[PDB]
Design a protein around this ligand. Structure first.
Ligand code: CA
Length: 234
């Protein structure tokens, strides 16, 4: 019953083959990426066409960054094992706040009212953007069963898209119910990426350009970001 979507590549853009993508979004014509880079973690503003960095901060050695999302004129970021997050001004990525949260923090996105965070479990949390505390909590299910390993997130036209860690699939989640209503199958997309680096890591990172309706997907150490369209299979 859950429709499956196949992809068509519209464009491929260069992606840093050393970049362990942990957070990824599109804003004001650019990509913003939270990356692990050889043991340390950075937040970068990236030119889409060239994949080159325009602006970057490197987090303190005590912290390792995970999901990031814009909120108004801020960027909000999660961490790997710190149980805390950060808020930066978007202009110069100056840190303005730290906040605590429960458990782990993997992917982060937002809709018009809330930040939405995953943590590698089936559970998604909707944060009040001022208090940065959970005001709604939902459990994600596919075929009526809990779906764990939810990672990078993106709000796309009223749905929550999520990477499922260790797979080449992206689930489309009904935000009212937590039910998976569609599955995007990206298996085989690496065969269309050109020469691959060694090592290479997993699919992870979804961004959405609301103005032009461009959907972008990438992965850890992946040599490309793909702009893709979707068609329902069968
Ligand atoms: Ca995202």
């Amino acid at each position: 019953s859950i429709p499956i979507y196949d992809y068509q590549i519209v464009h491929s853009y260069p992606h840093d083959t050393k970049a362990f993508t942990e957070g990824f979004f599109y804003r004001n014509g650019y990509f913003y990426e939270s990356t692990g880079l050889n043991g340390r973690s950075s937040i970068r503003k990236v030119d889409i066409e060239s994949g080159k960095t325009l602006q970057q901060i490197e987090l303190g050695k005590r912290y390792f960054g995970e999901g990031i999302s814009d909120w108004k004129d801020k960027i909000v970021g999660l961490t790997w094992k710190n149980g805390l997050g950060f808020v930066w001004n978007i202009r110069n990525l100056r840190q303005v706040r730290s906040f605590n949260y429960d458990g782990e923090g993997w992917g982060l996105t937002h809709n018009d009212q809330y930040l939405i965070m995953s943590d590698g479990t089936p559970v998604l949390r909707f944060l009040d953007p001022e208090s940065l505390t959970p005001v709604r909590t939902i459990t994600v299910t596919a075929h009526g069963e809990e779906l764990p390993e939810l990672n990078e997130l993106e709000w796309v036209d009223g749905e929550i898209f999520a990477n499922v860690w260790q797979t080449n699939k992206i689930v489309r989640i009904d935000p009212e119910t937590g039910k998976v209503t569609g599955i995007i199958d990206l298996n085989g997309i690496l065969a269309e990426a050109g020469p691959l680096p060694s090592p290479i890591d997993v699919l992870n990172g979804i961004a959405w350009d609301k103005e032009h309706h461009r959907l972008f997907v990438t992965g850890k150490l992946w040599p490309k970001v793909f702009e893709i369209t979707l068609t329902q299979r069968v």
